[PDB]
Amino acid sequence: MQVILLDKVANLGSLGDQVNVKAGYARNFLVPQGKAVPATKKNIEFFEARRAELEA
Amino acid sequence: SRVCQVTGKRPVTGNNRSHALNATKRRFLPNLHSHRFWVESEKRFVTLRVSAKGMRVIDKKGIDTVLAELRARGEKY
RNA sequence: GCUUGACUGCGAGCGUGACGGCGCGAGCAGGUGCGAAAGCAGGUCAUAGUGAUCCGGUGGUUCUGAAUGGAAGGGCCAUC
RNA sequence: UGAGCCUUGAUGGAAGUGUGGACGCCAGUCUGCAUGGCUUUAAUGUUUGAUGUUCUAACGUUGACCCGUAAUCCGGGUUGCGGACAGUGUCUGGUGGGUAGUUUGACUGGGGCGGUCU
RNA sequence: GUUUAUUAAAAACACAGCACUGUGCAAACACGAAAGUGGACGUAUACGGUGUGACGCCUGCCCGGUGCCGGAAGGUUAAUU
RNA sequence: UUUUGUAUAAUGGGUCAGCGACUUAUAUUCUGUAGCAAGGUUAACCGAAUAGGGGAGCCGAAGGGAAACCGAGUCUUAACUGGGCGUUAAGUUGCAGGGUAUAGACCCGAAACCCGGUGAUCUAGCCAUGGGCAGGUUGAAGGUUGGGUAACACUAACUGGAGGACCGAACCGACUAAUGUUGAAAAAUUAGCGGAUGACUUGUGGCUGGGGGUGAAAGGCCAAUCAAACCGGGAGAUAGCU
RNA sequence: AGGGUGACAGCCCCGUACACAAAAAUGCACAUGCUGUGAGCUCGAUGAGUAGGGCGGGACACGUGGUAUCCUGUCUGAAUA
RNA sequence: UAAGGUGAUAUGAACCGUUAUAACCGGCGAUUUCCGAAUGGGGAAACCCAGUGUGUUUCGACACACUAUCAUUAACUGAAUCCAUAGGUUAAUGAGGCGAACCGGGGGAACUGAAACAUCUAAGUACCCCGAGGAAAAGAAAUCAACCGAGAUUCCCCCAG
Description:
The structure is cut from a larger assembly and holds chains A and B. Chain A has helices spanning 23-30, 42-46; strands at 4-5, 36-37. Chain A is an alpha+beta fold. Chain B is α+β, with helices and mostly antiparallel strands. In chain B, the strands form 2 sheets. Chain B has a two-stranded antiparallel ribbon with strand order 1-2. Chain B has a two-stranded antiparallel sheet with strand order 3-4. Chain B is elongated, with a radius of gyration of 16 Å. The chains are: A alpha+beta, B alpha+beta. The PDB classes it as ribosome/antibiotic.
């Protein structure tokens, strides 16, 4: 399970960085609780197009 | 009905097989669990009866998409 | 005393078994020991001292080897 | 807390009035504390496994409550108690006459016992 | 009291009594691939299992074997890696 | 019929009639016979349908060697004076028959094993709800009261009315004998006999179903059967036996 | 062809060969209407918890074998002309 | 179509009919009790008991029709929880059961053979279960071949015991 983050979130968080997180933590807390999202690739651009249409 | 709501997995039959190679009818059955999935698209908890694997399928494809089927296929949820 | 004939390939022609098989055999080829030589030696005076087939192991051998070259596996000789 | 990497103090702006730790060639000198015109060493940040607490958010509830619902089922919801335990799938070692399928030779002055079986 | 309905009614079974043993309750145990249920609307003065078999006087020694109970060293030891 | 042997006092058959057991298919070989002959012959299918077409193919004219391969030879071995198997006999396709192979394979016969149904109207146990026990005894606790004690104890009458208590009918059982035993009866009759307010007895209905039930436990009972029920099915199980 | 008729029938009867038939309801064919329905070209796109793998089984004539291929209960998990 | 007719055991009775409404055959329609899927509820099948809307110069009561379940859809309603969802009522479609074999799938024996027996066999047979058609199923290559080339599935004969 990978998923990219929304909010801060401790020991990993970063408003949209690319973290690899244990299966459960995510499908059980990180989401269905807004704080991250399946790195569905459709997303790794969806949320990289920011790291371009922004930080440059 | 030990049956995975997402993947179709039901129990299957096979043999056991001693060293003596003795056939004895058995059953393999799905690692089922029935989980409380958060939808939000419905602001609710749909709880499916799932196989780890089904769960992986949900974890991939995505819940709203899985729930898409079933409904697409008549199933309850 | 000197030795490795307790040799390898074969074998006219006999025995004895329902059969699987066992047994005796001079002689031919290669190569060897003993003996000056003629010559003797294919274990032990003889007759007991043993276990088929399968499967598998070990060595040797291109005989085979599923498109081709190889390989795996199979065969063949030895052996467990 | 076992082990790797990054590093800032060890092997590979002077002299004097003053300090903890020590394989210190057996009797050193240091490694630091104050001042005064790629390989043998200590803690951080870590990465990586083990052990331990506690948390809650999977999961359990054969506590209480709300509603569907004039309902000792069920479902949803709230709350409390537990809690990543328990349990269940797959694999795996043990136990397992509870259940199962079977085996348990022939000869023989009947059979068995004894003996015998090339 | 019970029993072999149809060759056995007994000295067999059962019994109150006794002992051992298990069970903290979603009990053990039992029917059931499960859900559900008996136990029990009971809760260790209860529930199950096993033996003994009113009552009196009593019930000695043995723990090697087999069974069972406990054992946070070591040896040996599965999947996995 | 079986047997070394059977008048045999060993088997079978009361008798007559009808029926009743070596078959069919496909393979494979041999014999007979027919055709063609170093060749014989087609299968499916086509079809102008018992013709004709179709020669895919099969068998045979060449073996030896594990094989590569060689080839009237070849293999064995370095090679055999040699050895083994071969070269010197005509096949093939129908048709009838003799054997075999697979099939129930000559006919009939098990005790059983497996699957799926039907059965607690008999019986076992339980649940619910209802019914029944003539007559006659014994006379527990407790109570009253007198006697009695310092008070209790204790004691006598009475009163009371327990009990898997007694005797004994109905009711429930079934210890002995006799009869019966092609019965009156597939378990009884008759004389005796145990229980008879209880762990009693009994009506109606309900629940438990086969490796299952139920069992105060005999392997007892589960519809005249039970060390695994009845029915249908696997099924023509298998039978080296008769 | 066959059947029947007082015994065995081409010519007695019913048939057979042969040639004929439907107001109706239907079957199949075509031709047409209706509602649909999409046709042709150019530029694209080209099936992930999937293939593959560990384990356990199962299926392939193939009984784990040296064992390809296929399905998958369980754990995992690619490339992208 | 017709000069004969009202099926049969099975006569008789009383009748019908002869040129087109006797009968007879066939097409299409009417009617079609109760039980039975059985469907208003129940139930020991062929019986019991309703509710709702209707209807009677005699508008008590007794006739007629609707009212099962499930699925899809819609309309109206509508909780814990305010929106929503759940739920509820109604309406329209549909299904339901029966029955040869053949067919596809879920599950799946034993005797038996191996002259015992466990791997193996019998066999994916019998049997049970679900589903469907007139056929089913399968089907247009991540197939085979083998350096030439074939060109989906199905079926038959060889290949070959």
